[PDB]
């Protein structure tokens, strides 16, 4: 690998992410987004699922 | 899921288990997901 190479010969770092589901409890979960709490109103709450 | 429940009690009894009631609070829940059939005290 030399810096003066062509774009088809320049080094490329590749990261491959493999996602599998197994019978074990799934623990790599995506981030959960939380809103500004509103009190004293009839709202739909989803505390901790 | 490995559930560990714990309770700490101040006692002054010499030899045996005191007679009484104390509910064990949950200490930790670990998602270890492994088979356990035998255990050892250290
Ligand atoms: C756990 O281990 C015991 C003894 O090795 C075995 O009989 C049992 O089938 C195992 N269970 C699982 C879910 O692997």
From Swiss-Prot, chain B:
Changing residue 35 to Q: Increased resistance to neutralizing antibodies. Changing residue 23 to V: In strain: 20A.EU1. Attaches the virion to the cell membrane by interacting with host receptor, initiating the infection. The major receptor is host ACE2. When S2/S2' has been cleaved, binding to the receptor triggers direct fusion at the cell membrane. When S2/S2' has not been cleaved, binding to the receptor results in internalization of the virus by endocytosis using host TFRC and GRM2 and leading to fusion of the virion membrane with the host endosomal membrane. Alternatively, may use NRP1/NRP2 and integrin as entry receptors. The chain holds residues 200 to 241 of 1273 of the full protein. This is Spike protein S1. Glycans are attached at residue 35. The gene is S. Binds to host ACE2. RBD also interacts with the N-linked glycan on 'Asn-90' of ACE2. Cleavage of S generates a polybasic C-terminal sequence on S1 that binds to host Neuropilin-1 (NRP1) and Neuropilin-2 (NRP2) receptors. Interacts with host integrin alpha-5/beta-1 (ITGA5:ITGB1) and with ACE2 in complex with integrin alpha-5/beta-1 (ITGA5:ITGB1). May interact via cytoplasmic c-terminus with M protein. May interact (via N-terminus) with host bilirubin and biliverdin, thereby preventing antibody binding to the SARS-CoV-2 spike NTD via an allosteric mechanism.
């Amino acid at each position: 690998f030399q810096p003066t190479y062509g774009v088809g010969y320049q080094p490329y770092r590749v990261v491959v992410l493999s996602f599998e589901l197994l019978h074990a409890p799934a623990t790599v979960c995506g981030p959960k987004k939380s809103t500004n709490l509103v009190k004293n109103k009839c709202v739909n709450f989803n505390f901790n699922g | 899921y490995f559930k560990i429940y714990s309770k700490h009690t101040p006692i002054n009894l010499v030899r045996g288990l005191p007679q009484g009631f104390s509910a064990l609070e949950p200490l930790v829940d670990l998602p270890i997901g492994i088979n356990i059939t035998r255990f050892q005290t250290l």
